[PDB]
Amino acid sequence: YVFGVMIINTNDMSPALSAGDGVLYYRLRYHINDVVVYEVDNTLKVGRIAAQAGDEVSFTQEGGLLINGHPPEKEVPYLTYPHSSGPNFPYKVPTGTYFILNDYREERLDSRYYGALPINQIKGKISTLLRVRGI
Amino acid sequence: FQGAQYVFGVMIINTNDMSPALSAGDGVLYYRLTDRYHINDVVVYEVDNTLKVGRIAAQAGDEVSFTQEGGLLINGHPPEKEVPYLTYPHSSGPNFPYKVPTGTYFILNDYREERLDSRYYGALPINQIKGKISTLLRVRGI
Amino acid sequence: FQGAQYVFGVMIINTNDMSPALSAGDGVLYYRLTDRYHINDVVVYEVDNTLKVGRIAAQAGDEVSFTQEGGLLINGHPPEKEVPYLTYPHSSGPNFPYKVPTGTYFILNDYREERLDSRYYGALPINQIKGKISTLLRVRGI
Amino acid sequence: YVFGVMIINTNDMSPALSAGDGVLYYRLRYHINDVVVYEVDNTLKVGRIAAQAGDEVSFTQEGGLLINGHPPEKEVPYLTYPHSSGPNFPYKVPTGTYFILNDYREERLDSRYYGALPINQIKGKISTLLRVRGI
Amino acid sequence: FQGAQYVFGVMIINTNDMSPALSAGDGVLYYRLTDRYHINDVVVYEVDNTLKVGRIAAQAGDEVSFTQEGGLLINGHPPEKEVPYLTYPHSSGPNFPYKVPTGTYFILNDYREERLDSRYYGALPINQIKGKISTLLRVRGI
Amino acid sequence: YVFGVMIINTNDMSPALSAGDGVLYYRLRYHINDVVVYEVDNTLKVGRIAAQAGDEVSFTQEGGLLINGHPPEKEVPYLTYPHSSGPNFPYKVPTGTYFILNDYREERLDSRYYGALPINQIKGKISTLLRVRGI
Amino acid sequence: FQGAQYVFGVMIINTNDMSPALSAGDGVLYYRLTDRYHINDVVVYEVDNTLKVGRIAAQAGDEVSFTQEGGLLINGHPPEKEVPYLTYPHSSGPNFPYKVPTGTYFILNDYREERLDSRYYGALPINQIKGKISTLLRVRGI
Amino acid sequence: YVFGVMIINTNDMSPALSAGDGVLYYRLRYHINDVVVYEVDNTLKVGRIAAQAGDEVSFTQEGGLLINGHPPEKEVPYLTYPHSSGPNFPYKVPTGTYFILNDYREERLDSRYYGALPINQIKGKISTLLRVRGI
């Protein structure tokens, strides 16, 4: 029904997505591993959904991520540490929200800083990428 | 001789050897240059009646070697492009350090643990390069 | 084995051997079929490390012959496609009548006076067909 | 990994797919509602997967289809009657097979004639369609 | 006046009003004709600052009417294109039988149960037609 | 400046152009061998310009065409005979007109029937062809 | 409401108002952004039922003025893009200095001697921008 | 017959052509205003043909260019001054050569430095440009 188009403008989602990528996203109920466009502070961001309503989200001392004890499907070539000004973990994911992580985990301004994003702040699932340079 | 020459090719990627830059199922476009390619270009190339993709890591006159800690050296310096893997030789490849011949390109899989690239074949002659991948379309598995 | 497979190719035509259907400088698009081609398709194909274009005049099991008046016969009947030229064998081609082998296509230049087509090479194996020309873009010389 | 390309050459799958459509299919484990290319008698066909190993497949007097009593997700603007030279129904779907139906149900030479197709005869799932005429 | 004119547009379909020919999420290409469109063309058109798609069911001078059994008549005959739905007027549309004006096209949703088409708006002037949908790309929901 | 787009709908210009071809034409002063869109009787046609203001146009008994005695640059695989209800030849081409011929010369409803076309009836030069079937 | 939304448009340029960046007869592609455009983008836009092209010289909140020597100032500084012409106001345009409104873009012809751009119309609301020209194909007149 | 493809890698031909442009060129007899790819010192360059065999090429004190007294068709927003290590002007263009100028005339390493280019060093006429960024 509703489709958006944007140019990715950070490397928060690298290497899955890079600055300058073109994306198409549509407004959806999301699923773990969906990559979504969302808004915080009148600013569009992209991130991947690591957890949904009810899950608990914990860290290991060795930079690892746990959703309900067990670590995630998706792997990234980074260690995941908490943000110091973020909610306490372990962290329970509220109804109507989704816990969102940057694939490039060294950028810690995702749900680890904001908490889970409410639905009304999620603009849609990215269904198509067109990369036209920097292959 | 020639009836027709390529300007572009539109292909689907069959392998994860260029992962994570490229994934199986990705659509790509390449364009064919009549002059030279460049370092870091991802190219489509042919070896053994077999189409392959890889990234140009060195060109004519360059010297390629490895450190004991799985690092790649081009002319004694480490390359621009970084990949989340270590690079080791193919035991049945040519000798290193390896002087890249005139008119050839030394091509590496971004997914370095697959070693069927120039580590096994040596550098590829230009005439076996089909073109440079300039564009990518991914629809699933983002 | 394969890194990548063609879905389309976008090419420029270098020859007038397919004239007047195709002219030098024409841009074309082809698509690659995994199954079989058909009679009257114009295809891009390779023989002797050389890309060529031509039109499929017969397929596996067909019989190709010539009349003394420069006419082509496929299975004893004249073909659908008409060209403003006569068709004669290549003196150094195979024998006719010619039984088209399994898994091959008998390909002819629309500009029949150029005889470096299946009249010289025999029928082409399918694996040497790159794809079917579906689209044409002409900008000059209309 | 392995991709095929073909031109649909019947209207067995109409309106979902029409003769002259171009498709891309890849070799997969299939799911109900997948549309797949398959071979019978050295001939490529396309059809949609209505049932999998273990299911039972039954007809109603009123041209309706039942998979395990309950009728299917996918609806088509045709009634589904059995083929007279086909297996008996109700019909239990063997392991390693998939029961395949034409969307255009008046063409009855699908699994209703052949039975369920074994995997080795399924060439792949159609993932992309390009229709270039007859829109 | 004009800086630029459309030759093609590449669009995504937002509605199921043209279902099953077209579905939400489909990609389409249209081309813009300078002359006339034809019956059965699916076109992109604008009404109320709003882009819409539909299929041309009648043209200038034609007469459109309905039977009591939900059938469409064009010039007293039923149309070529068949859809798996019945066609009824929009209670707030113009009168029928309806004489199609000069320079207009009478456009219908293939999914006839949605009646916001020419049954409500009347026939659309040509200058509000953006072009004809010639190509379709579907990737999900096949 | 002004561009038109049309679908060729005859084979008058075959093989150069075929029914179903897409063309782009722009409004120009034309030159011999230009292929142009023109109007006669509220109907768009296409043809190639064989002669301009001042030229004389004559036929040979052997189906040949003469512009000022000498035959044309462009050759076609047809013989060119006059139309019986057309102007007398030899035929002098008026100022402000262009003598237009069908490449497929067996269709004789070009300038051989109409005479030379005035400029105001020539809609433009075809600069681009896109053939999408029947190659 | 919407049946379909643009992702790309492929257009031909009818004017030399964007010369020498763009020329009459150029083919272009644009893509439609759902978010904001940027300064220096060349965009297709509509004003008075009329498609136009131009280059975004300023955005919301910016201040546009002219020097007596035919120079353009954006926020008191001269802009990045240089054109081989001088810029003067349109005598019947709005007042300058000109505060660019919220949700609008101040658009200028690269060929500045044609003044039917934001110098006459003011800044264009975003909803009247069709998209950004990203690609150019020139075949004649190079 | 023979087509080349290259990426323009200077702004010598700006604004007509810019670094990063893609071009198509074919091997030809050239004409004034043709833009051509040519080689000097095992290096591909592009330039526009200002004069041919027999012409004379002169400069005015006011940065202007004369071909046979009369200045050129093509205008550029630059003044044209000689190169100090180039041939003497006025300069007569030898048979079998073409006098080539950079559109961006402040780059003086064109025929003003090299003299006219022989044919065997001209690789072809640029017939198509594709600009994909920096519009």
Numbering used by the authors:
A (entry chain B), D (entry chain B), F (entry chain B), H (entry chain B): 37 to 64, 67 to 173
B (entry chain A), C (entry chain A), E (entry chain A), G (entry chain A): 32 to 173
Manuscript excerpt for this entry:
Here we describe the crystal structure of a SipA molecule that comprises the complete extracellular portion of the protein. SipA comprises two all-β domains that appear to be typical of the S26 signal peptidase family and is highly similar to E. coli SPaseI. In the present structure the 3-stranded sheet comprising strands β1, β2 and β10 is fully formed and presents an outer face populated with exposed hydrophobic residues (Tyr37, Phe39, Val41, Ile43, Leu60, Tyr62 Leu168 and Val170). The present structure shows that although SipA shares the SPase-I fold, the catalytic serine and lysine residues characteristic of active signal peptidases are missing, as was earlier suggested by sequence alignments. Although SipA lacks the catalytic residues of SPase-I, it retains the peptide-binding cleft found in E. coli SPase-I. Examination of the packing reveals that SipA forms an octamer whose basic unit is a dimer formed by molecules A and B, the asymmetric unit of the crystal. Two such dimers then associate through interaction of the N-terminal strand of molecule A with the equivalent strand of a neighbouring dimer related by crystal symmetry. This tetramer forms a horseshoe structure, with two such tetramers associating, again by crystal symmetry, to form the octamer. The electron density is indicative of phospholipids, with a phosphate head-group and two lipid acyl chains, which we have modelled as phosphatidylethanolamine (PE). Four phospholipid molecules, presumed to originate from the E. coli host strain during purification, pack together at the interface between the tetramers. An intriguing feature of the SipA crystal structure is that the peptide-binding cleft of molecule A binds the N-terminal peptide of a symmetry-related molecule within the SipA octamer.
The shaft is assembled by covalent polymerisation of successive BP molecules, while the minor pilin AP1 (Cpa) is the adhesin at the tip of the pilus and the basal pilin AP2 covalently links the pilus to the cell wall peptidoglycan. In FCT types 2, 3 and 4, another gene, sipA, is clustered with the pilin and sortase genes, in a strictly conserved order (cpa, sipA, fctA, srtC, fctB) and its gene product SipA has been shown for several FCT3 strains to be essential for pilus polymerisation. SipA falls into this category of 'inactive' peptidases. We show that it has no peptidase activity, but that it is essential for polymerisation of pilin subunits in FCT2 pili, and that its function is likely to be conserved in all strains of S. pyogenes that carry a SipA homologue.
